Amino acid sequence: ELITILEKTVSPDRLELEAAQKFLERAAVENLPTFLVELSRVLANPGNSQVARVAAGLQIKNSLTSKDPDIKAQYQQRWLAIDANARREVKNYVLQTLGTETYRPSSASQCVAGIACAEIPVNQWPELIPQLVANVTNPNSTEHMKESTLEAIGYICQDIDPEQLQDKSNEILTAIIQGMRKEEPSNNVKLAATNALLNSLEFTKANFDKESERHFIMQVVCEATQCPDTRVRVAALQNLVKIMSLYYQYMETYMGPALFAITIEAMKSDIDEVALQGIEFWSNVCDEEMDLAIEASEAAEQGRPPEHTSKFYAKGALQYLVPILTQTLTKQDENDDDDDWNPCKAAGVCLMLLATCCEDDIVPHVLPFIKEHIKNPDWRYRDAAVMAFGCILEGPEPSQLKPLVIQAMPTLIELMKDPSVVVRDTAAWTVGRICELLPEAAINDVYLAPLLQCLIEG
Amino acid sequence: VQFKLVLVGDGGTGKTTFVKRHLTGEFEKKYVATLGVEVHPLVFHTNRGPIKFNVWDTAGQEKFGGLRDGYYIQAQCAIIMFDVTSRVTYKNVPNWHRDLVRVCENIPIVLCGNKVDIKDRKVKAKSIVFHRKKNLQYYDISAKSNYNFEKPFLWLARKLIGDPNLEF
Numbered sequence: 001e002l003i004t005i006l007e008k009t010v011s012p013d014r015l016e017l018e019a020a021q022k023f024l025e026r027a028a029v030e031n032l033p034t035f036l037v038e039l040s041r042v043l044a045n046p047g048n049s050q051v052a053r054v055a056a057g058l059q060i061k062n063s064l065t066s067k068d069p070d071i072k073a074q075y076q077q078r079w080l081a082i083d084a085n086a087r088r089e090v091k092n093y094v095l096q097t098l099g100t101e102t103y104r105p106s107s108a109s110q111c112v113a114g115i116a117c118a119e120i121p122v123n124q125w126p127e128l129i130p131q132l133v134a135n136v137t138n139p140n141s142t143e144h145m146k147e148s149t150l151e152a153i154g155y156i157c158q159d160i161d162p163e164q165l166q167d168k169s170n171e172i173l174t175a176i177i178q179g180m181r182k183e184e185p186s187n188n189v190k191l192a193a194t195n196a197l198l199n200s201l202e203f204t205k206a207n208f209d210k211e212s213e214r215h216f217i218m219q220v221v222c223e224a225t226q227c228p229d230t231r232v233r234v235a236a237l238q239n240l241v242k243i244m245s246l247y248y249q250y251m252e253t254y255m256g257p258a259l260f261a262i263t264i265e266a267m268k269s270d271i272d273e274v275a276l277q278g279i280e281f282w283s284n285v286c287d288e289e290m291d292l293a294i295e296a297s298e299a300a301e302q303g304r305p306p307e308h309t310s311k312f313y314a315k316g317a318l319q320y321l322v323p324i325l326t327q328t329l330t331k332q333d334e335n336d337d338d339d340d341w342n343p344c345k346a347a348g349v350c351l352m353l354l355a356t357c358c359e360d361d362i363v364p365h366v367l368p369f370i371k372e373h374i375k376n377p378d379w380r381y382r383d384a385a386v387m388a389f390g391c392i393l394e395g396p397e398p399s400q401l402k403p404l405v406i407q408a409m410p411t412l413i414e415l416m417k418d419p420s421v422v423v424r425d426t427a428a429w430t431v432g433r434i435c436e437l438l439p440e441a442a443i444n445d446v447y448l449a450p451l452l453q454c455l456i457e458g
Numbered sequence: 459v460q461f462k463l464v465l466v467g468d469g470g471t472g473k474t475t476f477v478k479r480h481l482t483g484e485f486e487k488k489y490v491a492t493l494g495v496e497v498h499p500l501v502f503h504t505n506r507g508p509i510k511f512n513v514w515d516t517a518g519q520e521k522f523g524g525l526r527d528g529y530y531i532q533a534q535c536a537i538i539m540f541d542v543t544s545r546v547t548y549k550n551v552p553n554w555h556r557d558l559v560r561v562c563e564n565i566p567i568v569l570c571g572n573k574v575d576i577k578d579r580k581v582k583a584k585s586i587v588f589h590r591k592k593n594l595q596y597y598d599i600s601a602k603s604n605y606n607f608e609k610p611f612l613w614l615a616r617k618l619i620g621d622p623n624l625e626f
């Protein structure tokens with residue numbers, strides 16, 4: 001009746017779930033070896049319902065790991081203490097299920113990784129990595145076979161201490177690229193591979209130090225950003241974001257001859273999830289460069305900047321990013337809500353990051369758009385104009401930031417009575433931010449005060 | 459029309475309190491850790507008929523996890539909760555997200571920062587960036603003041619129904 005209780009795990013009745021949980025915990029205590037062997041058999045049988053197979057897989061996986069590092073160490077020890085023949089049984093059934101699950105995220109992959117993290121560091125599953133590599137490269141492997149193991153490979157690299165699997169990183173990377181490469185026919189496979197790479201980025205630190213291999217990884221990622229499938233593009237762009245955060249110093253050779261145009265193209269995409277990542281790429285560059293600046297701000301001293309080399313990519317792309325960002329502030333539907341997380345909202349966030357990142361050069365680049373659309377009949381452009389103005393009030397020294405008083409203010413006040421509610425709300429937002437900056441430009445006692453007073457009512 | 463929604467996040471982030479608020483309208487002042495999971499259906503009336511969310515309110519405490527991951531089977535959406543007054547609950551967000559995607563394929567996931575009613579936030583707006591990384595929807599939330607308390611469900615409903623015009 002193991003399948004019966006596993007079937008109860010999806011029931012909404014607490015009484016059913018508790019009964020199922022109590023039954024599962026007891027079986028684990030009673031005889032872990034037989035429990036895990038049977039669970040692996042339920043997992044391996046494509047005749048079982050998805051609920052039964054996934055529940056069995058998670059039971060096995062949760063017996064090998066824990067969010068608690070001590071419990072995990074004990075679980076890994078508990079597994080290693082199991083009869084090696086029984087473990088071979090669980091391992092066989094688990095590997096054999098790769099390619100037999102008709103549902104996307106597979107559960108065998110997690111089991112493979114759970115057991116791998118416990119056995120590899122003691123060198124006990126020497127056939128694992130070679131088998132997985134062959135599953136991916138074999139020309140006759142099915143799409144499910146490829147996805148399943150790519151997921152597993154990525155999980156392994158994301159979960160084991162790097163140190164324990166380096167002896168095979170090159171072979172692992174090769175399988176991942178094979179699954180990512182253009183020639184691979186299935187987008188589901190390309191997705192699984194691109195996701196596996198992302199989950200494995202931190203594990204591939206050593207490889208990133210090898211120029212030849214570093215070139216190949218950037219090779220496949222950039223190419224993947226050109227894949228017709230939107231999901232693969234997004235995942236590939238996400239890899240670039242993560243790479244810029246983990247390997248900032250190796251980007252010189254790729255920024256300009258490749259990254260720049262790819263991310264710029266993504267930002268302009270009409271596919272929201274794609275534009276979001278293209279935008280995040282640059283918002284992320286601002287976050288990394290702002291750190292390299294807080295780091296460099298070491299006229300406190302102890303040598304030269306740690307290993308800081310802010311190459312100011314943001315400053316260099318600014319002239320191209322702004323017109324794209326301000327234009328994006330225009331993309332708002334009649335059904336969009338003020339706080340939906342969409343390209344329009346991301347552009348605002350990116351603009352502000354550029355505002356503090358390149359404290360001055362923004363004003364010159366944004367003002368033209370503000371002046372051209374601050375009165376545009378189309379509220380989208382009108383709103384974009386007001387929003388942009390407010391995105392540059394944080395960074396530029398108030399001295400230069402006085403083009404709010406003269407020209408802005410009067411119009412910013414009128415726009416608060418705009419027929420469009422979107423425009424009104426954004427106007428208020430902008431005006432409110434101006435009140436915060438005014439004291440910086442204190443210039444005029446008993447005039448800065450009364451203004452703030454009156455303004456406040458608004 | 460109903461959907462399985464799994465509510466996850468660190469212990470004490472206010473998951474249970476958040477659900478009860480929508481359920482009875484009452485604000486639970488006590489902290490009584492959830493054991494394993496507590497399933498509660500929440501119904502919302504919309505301009506396109508009532509939508510029911512079967513909320514699986516999971517335990518955030520490692521020790522009271524129960525089936526943990528096992529509760530995600532066939533989930534159709536999720537809400538990840540962290541405490542704006544506790545930096546470590548935001549730090550663990552990536553781990554909750556990873557747990558969700560290793561079981562659920564392509565479900566809509568909303569990230570929620572709770573307890574914004576509290577005076578000093580330990581996790582300020584500028585620090586919240588996980589949603590940008592994974593293209594998630596984000597919301598400042600407060601189970602106590604009801605600030606944006608329906609937003610998470612409205613966004614998910616619009617996502618599941620496929621109608622951006624859905625209203626509550």
Ligand SMILES: Nc1nc2c(ncn2[C@@H]2O[C@H](COP(=O)(O)OP(=O)(O)NP(=O)(O)O)[C@@H](O)[C@H]2O)c(=O)[nH]1
Pocket residue numbers: 467468469470471472473474475476486487488489490491492493516517518519572573574575576599600601602603
């Ligand atoms: N100030 C304030 N307190 C809140 C808010 N929501 C939750 N709380 C408080 O936070 C505490 C924990 O809430 P609870 O619902 O038990 O959290 P949980 O996420 O369900 N914990 P667990 O995972 O262990 O089951 C309670 O004291 C509750 O009153 C909020 O928006 N503001």
Ligand SMILES: [Mg+2]
Pocket residue numbers: 473474475489490491492
């Ligand atoms: Mg609780």
